[PDB]
Nucleic acid binder design. Structure first.
Length: 1308
RNA sequence: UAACUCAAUUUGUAAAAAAGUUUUAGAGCUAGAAAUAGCAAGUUAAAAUAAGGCUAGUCCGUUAUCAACUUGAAAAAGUG
DNA sequence: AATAGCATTTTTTACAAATTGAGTTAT
DNA sequence: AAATGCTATTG
């Protein structure tokens, strides 16, 4: 017979259902393979498939890239040791050996146990002399004394091993705050007597370098400068000091929007363009700002002078040490005096987050400071210690989270010192001073990637030499350019219309030309004389470009109607019917090159344009000046420096969507003009790009089609890989159902798809940039930012009257949606305006009145600049003053509310339709045997709420299956009752408020009570009956009442990390796992808690007693992710090695996670691991009870059904008890559930329902979970033994579950 | 459906950084047969950071994909 | 069996591709 | 961001 398919596609569940003609889902009696009593079983063709969320590639990428860093840092140290090799031997036989075995216990050590000197006395003395590595570093930088070759390696290696960041370009130097601010002032002063600025020199070191941020410290630095805008030149010179990218366009009235970034590798190149345009006399402004900006950077990383020591970092680290030494000594005597009884807790007990916990225990700085703060202020004579603790400067370590600020510049400055000292004493240091710096310096560029040799899936570089790559021969042995090119060319699109070809760059002239002449051709004009607006003159367009478009970047219709009509075609008033504002397509690259080339002869002529295409392609391709430099040398012979050196200055972003071939090249023989040249003159047709292709008169739409894997297809979908998993299983589900129907494709298919830590870092960052005074009466809670009344008030200034909404008034203050809930159903937040009242926003029957937009738009551009909300929020917000949600704007919001427009879903549709519709007809046209209907995600949600088919998720997993049914129902109906919409829902080929009245009344044809609808609703053409509100509305009721629903959970081998990542200390346990072959976890610790990949059923024997008497056994052994590859290679040896004797190789059942077992009384179990099970049972509460628990939780007429038919409780609790006692088996907890029910019967009607919905966690399928029953938590009763399963009935489901092989595990 | 303009999320890749943790090294001191007392110290470093693998690279090693049965190296097909 | 503690973090630069949602043009 | 299989301890 005929049938359809419904599908409910989520990230964790594909729901599926089959309906026949009478909206009925058939049963069907499938075989049962295996060795059980059952040969057969009748299942309904409804069900779901559950599965664990698919995951993104980020965690593996972060770890993969982290592992590339570790193996490099190692070779970074190896490069150093290789240098020191031959000379170190002469000093110490095996110094490098003693380091490499540092970690080994004394018992397994080959050399002395003291790594540095190889005996006790020297080593003890080394530490006594230089208590921190920084001491040695400093002393090696200052002292001129010939140093020990081992202490030189140990300073160099420390500087190389942890070498700080590569964020800042160029060479900053410790040249530094107030005495460099005076130089900026005196520079800006003696450039400008006439505009004078002064502040003397007192409070400079603080107002910049205070407790608060860097951006808000410009407001307390620059606003102190009375009669200067901080957004002027001297501000923008203090702006560069903090670390901004200002644009000095206005300041020196320069036409080009010149922007300078100080850390950028482009700044010295960006310095030349501003001085050569402003003069050389203004150099001392930048060359005195970079001094102060340096200061700004160093001022937070180092607390020393540079006048005494040439190692200001290492020195500054010693300073922290000595303060750490003093502050300790003091706090030692201060405890011995006032609280000598609490000395143990603070200095001896590691456990408590005291000092003793701070050092030898796991107490961080933040944790330690939070436990001493109340003991400081109590104990008098600790004034500075609180000042330190409140400045984060109390008892610092030299190795701390906030060492991230130190750039490699600072460490290289010291590494250079040491070498410059000891080369005088060591010949190999003098010769290799280049190499030893370069090991610190060199840094594989991101546009090269893994230095691989055809064995890295991810790599892409090109090898110029095949020899090994070192930091010193890199540019010799790697083709950096070619690699740098391939980095981009392996990601940018091909031409859709010609897949073999590659898209041109978004700023290519030949492209730029095409964009305009496609937008220009359709511009129609009307004057005083003309009677029907005439389209643009094919012949005359070449002037409109040369006159208006080649002249400026932006072409204005206002600057195109006024300039052209009035000065070209003696035309008074100019009305433009094609476009009314600024043109989208600009020739900007023509006006961008014409300023730099200063030749409209070369440009405009274009007798050879192929040279200029490379130039602009190179500017888009690379971002490194160094890369761009060489690449542009090919065309230096035509231009001097100022013409070919400002071309390294120009940089371009983006790629085009169309190739060069298509645009200019692929022509027609009949035509004899390209798509660009045909756009420039099409006579009296002036046809478009989309025209030019598809016009059957032209040969293009053929050429394109004629010149033009499930996993690949699904992979290629743009969408969360989490949804890409539901999509693949959907297609498998479908593939299987079709086979169940004797390989007979369906009539239709209906698809459907659903939709604190982030806050903390976003709010803190925002609170650092804002200057809000949050904290004054807004204490911190890391979690409670998910409070929506708290997140939207804050985001202390209320929206309606532009005042301050109170905390009690923030609960009473309304929250309006940006657009009424009728136009767009969107998450409350990104349209989440809270007003004093709704009566401020205006009429709810459209978008807010112009009056409030006229009123507040001047403030709406003060938070768009602050970037609080997207600019598309301000488009609708300002749409009252722009236009206003018209009766077409509303009809389109009410049409898209039911029609799926999301691209993922369309593809799901394209994929499914393509797979069903394979056969063709007489005239090469496709046969559409199966119709795929995409339905939005609120038809059924309404259909259920409207017609008493309510959903309660908590009860069981049927909702996903039920939805795929309803989705099938509505889908076949809305296609029967409106067949004209098979171009709107199906995949394949005042009147605005009348399209609205269609869309918004489409679903009313189900009803019976609108203000009188007929009983049998029919077709608007055929005599086909489509909905029989008498019969069909009780078949739907019937289906949701069906208790046997096919629920299946994907069986999945586990992948990912070997174990928990925590490196635990040494311990006596076989649960520890060695981090390294010869690293006995008795001695060295390791990991525990490995993830098992899958279990296997071993049937074999094990030796018993000293007799080695084989005793037979049958148990589950967990093959861990790390074990796995070993066990698969040779399962017998792996298992024999485990102690198993005479393994039955035929009986080794592979058991991945979620394997279902049927035990007795239909009690079912899913193995979660070798030694824990989870609830494999699903409870079907009858439909009667479901609708009760929804209303009981929660127009007037069905309320009475709650009070009446009440006490559905007593019978619910029962069904739960009868289930919990049969399959769950959590005696104590079911006795606490009952015991807590009976003592809450005097609690309201709703409350008892709200806790029964909490009760289903007990009976829910999957892992036991804790849950509350009123004010009584109920700890999870887990299943921590698989013994029972070993003699149960392993069930092998098919993806639907309709096919089963059941194996009774009474093997042995 | 296509190009176009403007501004948000999602996905994928590469290059870098700072910590954390683990063992060792940094002679603890007296008093006591010992348990235990008193006190002195404490900030640093080396090395490991998936076990590892062969393709031996300054590469690869945590994504995706997985009922059963028969057939296939696999992909996949066939089976009610 | 009931019971309880446990889980590696954070930061920067560079690029590409779709999507979504406000506009002009056309098939 | 929880959520849930390890780990160990208990009478």
């Amino acid at each position: 017979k005929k049938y359809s398919i419904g599908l409910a596609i989520g990230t964790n569940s594909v729901g599926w259902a089959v309906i026949t003609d009478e909206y009925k889902v058939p049963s069907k009696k499938f075989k049962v393979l295996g060795n059980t009593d059952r040969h057969s079983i009748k299942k309904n063709l409804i069900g779901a498939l559950l599965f664990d969320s698919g995951e993104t590639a980020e965690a593996t990428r972060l770890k993969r890239t982290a592992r590339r860093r570790y193996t490099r840092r190692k070779n970074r140290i190896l490069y150093l040791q290789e240098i020191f090799s031959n000379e170190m031997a002469k000093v110490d036989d095996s110094f490098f050996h003693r380091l490499e075995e540092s970690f080994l216990v004394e018992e397994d050590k080959k050399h002395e146990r003291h790594p540095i000197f190889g005996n006790i006395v020297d080593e003890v003395a080394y530490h006594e002399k230089y208590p921190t590595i920084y001491h040695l570093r400093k002393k090696l930088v200052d002292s001129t004394d010939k140093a020990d070759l081992r202490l030189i390696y140990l300073a160099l290696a420390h500087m190389i091993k942890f070498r700080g960041h590569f964020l800042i370009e160029g060479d900053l130097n410790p040249d530094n705050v107030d005495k460099l601010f005076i130089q900026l002032v005196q520079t800006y002063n003696q450039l400008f007597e006439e505009n004078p600025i002064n502040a003397s020199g007192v409070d400079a070191k603080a107002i910049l370098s205070a407790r608060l941020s860097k951006s808000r410290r410009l407001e307390n630095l620059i606003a102190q400068l009375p009669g200067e805008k901080k957004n002027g030149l001297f501000g923008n010179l203090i702006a560069l000091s903090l670390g901004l990218t200002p644009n000095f366009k206005s300041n020196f009235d320069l036409a080009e929007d010149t922007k300078l970034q100080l850390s950028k590798d482009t700044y010295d190149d960006d310095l030349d363009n501003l001085l050569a345009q402003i003069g050389d006399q203004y150099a001392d402004l930048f060359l005195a700002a970079k001094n102060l900006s340096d200061a700004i950077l160093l001022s937070d990383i180092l607390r020393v002078n540079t006048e005494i020591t040439k190692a200001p970092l290492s020195a500054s680290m010693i300073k922290l040490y000595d303060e750490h030494h003093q502050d300790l000594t003091l706090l030692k005597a201060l405890v011995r005096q006032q609280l000598p009884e609490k000395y143990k807790e603070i200095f001896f007990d590691q456990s408590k987050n005291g000092y003793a916990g701070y050092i030898d225990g796991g107490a961080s700085q933040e944790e330690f400071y939070k436990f001493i703060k109340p003991i400081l202020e109590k104990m008098d004579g600790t004034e500075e210690l609180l000042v330190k603790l409140n400045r984060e400067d109390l008892l610092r370590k030299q190795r701390t989270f906030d060492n991230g600020i130190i750039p490699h510049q600072i460490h290289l400055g010291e590494l250079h010192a040491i070498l410059r000292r000891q080369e005088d004493f060591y010949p190999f240091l003098k010769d290799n001073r280049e190499k030893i710096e370069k090991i610190l310096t060199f840094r594989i560029p991101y546009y090269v990637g893994p230095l691989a040799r055809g064995n890295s899936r991810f790599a892409w570089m090109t090898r110029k030499s095949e020899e090994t790559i070192t930091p010193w021969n890199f540019e010799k042995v790697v083709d950096k350019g070619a690699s740098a090119q391939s980095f981009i060319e392996r990601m940018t699109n091909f031409d859709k219309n010609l897949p073999n070809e590659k898209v041109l760059p978004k700023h290519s002239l030949l492209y730029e030309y095409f964009t305009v002449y496609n937008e220009l051709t359709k511009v129609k004009y009307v004057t005083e004389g003309m009677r029907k607006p005439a389209f643009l003159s094919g012949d005359q367009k070449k002037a409109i470009v040369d006159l208006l478009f080649k002249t400026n970047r932006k072409v204005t219709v206002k600057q195109l109607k006024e300039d052209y009509f009035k000065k070209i075609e003696e035309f008074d008033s100019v009305e433009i019917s094609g476009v009314e504002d600024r043109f989208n397509a600009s020739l900007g690259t023509y006006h961008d090159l014409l300023k730099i080339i200063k030749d409209k002869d070369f440009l405009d002529n274009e007798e050879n344009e192929d040279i200029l295409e490379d130039i602009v392609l190179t500017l888009t391709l690379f971002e490194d000046r160094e890369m761009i430099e060489e690449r542009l040398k090919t065309y230096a012979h035509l231009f001097d420096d100022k013409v070919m050196k400002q071309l390294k200055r120009r940089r371009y972003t983006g790629w085009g969507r169309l190739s060069r071939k298509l645009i200019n090249g692929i022509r027609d023989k009949q035509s004899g003009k390209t798509i660009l040249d045909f756009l420039k003159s099409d006579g009296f047709a002036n046809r478009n790009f989309i025209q030019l292709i598809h016009d059957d008169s032209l040969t293009f739409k053929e050429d394109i089609q004629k010149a033009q894997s499930l996993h690949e297809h699904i992979a290629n979908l743009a969408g969360s890989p989490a949804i890409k998993k539901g999509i693949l299983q959907t297609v498998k589900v479908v593939d299987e159902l079709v086979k169940v129907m004797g390989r007979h494709k369906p009539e239709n298919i209906v698809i459907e798809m659903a939709r604190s830590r982030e806050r903390m870092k976003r709010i803190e960052e925002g609170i650092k940039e804002l200057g809000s005074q949050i904290l004054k009466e807004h204490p911190v809670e890391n979690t409670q930012l998910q409070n929506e009344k708290l997140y939207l008030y804050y985001l202390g200034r209320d929206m309606y009257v532009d005042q301050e909404l109170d905390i009690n008034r923030l609960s009473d203050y309304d929250v309006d949606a940006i657009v009424p809930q009728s136009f767009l159903k969107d998450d409350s937040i990104d349209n989440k305006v809270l007003t004093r009242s709704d009566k401020n926003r205006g009429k709810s029957d459209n978008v807010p009145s112009e009056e409030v937009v006229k009123k507040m738009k001047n403030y709406w551009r003060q938070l768009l600049n602050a970037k609080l909300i997207t600019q598309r929020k301000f488009d609708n917000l300002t749409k009252a003053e722009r236009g206003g949600l018209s009766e077409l704007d509303k009809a389109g919001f009410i049409k898209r509310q039911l029609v799926e427009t999301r691209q993922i879903t369309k593809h799901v549709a394209q994929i499914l339709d393509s797979r069903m519709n394979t056969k063709y007809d007489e005239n090469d046209k496709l046969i559409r045997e199966v119709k795929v209907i995409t339905l939005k995600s609120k038809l059924v949600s309404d259909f259920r709420k409207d017609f008493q088919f309510y959903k309660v998720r908590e009860i069981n997993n049927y909702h996903h299956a039920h939805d795929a049914y309803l989705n099938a129902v509505v889908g076949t109906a809305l296609i029967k009752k409106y067949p004209k919409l098979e171009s709107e829902f199906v995949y394949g080929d005042g009147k605005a408020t009348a399209k609205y009245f269609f869309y918004s009344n489409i679903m009313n044809f189900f009803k019976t009570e609108i203000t009188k609808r007929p009983l049998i609703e029919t077709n608007g053409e055929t005599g086909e009956i489509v909905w029989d509100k008498g019969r069909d509305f009780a078949t739907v009721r019937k289906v949701l009442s069906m208790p046997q629903v096919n629920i299946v959970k994907k069986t999945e081998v586990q992948t990912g990390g070997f174990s928990k990542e925590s490196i635990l200390p040494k311990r006596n346990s076989d649960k520890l796992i060695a981090r390294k072959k010869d690293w006995d976890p008795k001695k060295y610790g390791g990991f525990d808690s490995p993830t098992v990949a899958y279990s296997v059923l071993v049937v074999a024997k094990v030796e018993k007693g000293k007799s080695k008497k084989l005793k037979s056994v049958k148990e589950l052994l967990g093959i861990t992710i790390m074990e796995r590859s070993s066990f698969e290679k040779n399962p017998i040896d792996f298992l024999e090695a485990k102690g198993y004797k005479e393994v039955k190789k035929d009986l080794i059942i592979k058991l991945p996670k979620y394997s279902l077992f049927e035990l007795e009384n239909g009690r079912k179990r899913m193995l979660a691991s070798a030694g824990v099970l989870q609830k494999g049972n699903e409870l079907a509460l009858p439909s009667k009870y479901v609708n009760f628990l929804y209303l009981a939780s929660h127009n007037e007429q069905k309320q009475l059904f709650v009070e009446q038919h009440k006490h559905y409780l007593d019978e619910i609790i029962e069904q739960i008890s009868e289930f919990s006692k049969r399959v769950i088996l959590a005696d104590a907890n079911l006795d606490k559930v009952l015991s807590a029910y009976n003592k809450h019967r005097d609690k309201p009607i709703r409350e008892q329902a709200e806790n029964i919905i909490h009760l289903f966690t007990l009976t829910n399928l999957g892992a036991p979970a804790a849950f509350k029953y009123f004010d009584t938590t109920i700890d999870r009763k887990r299943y921590t033994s698989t013994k029972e399963v070993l003699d149960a009935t392993l069930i092998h489901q098919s993806i639907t579950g309709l096919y089963e092989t059941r194996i009774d595990l009474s093997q042995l």
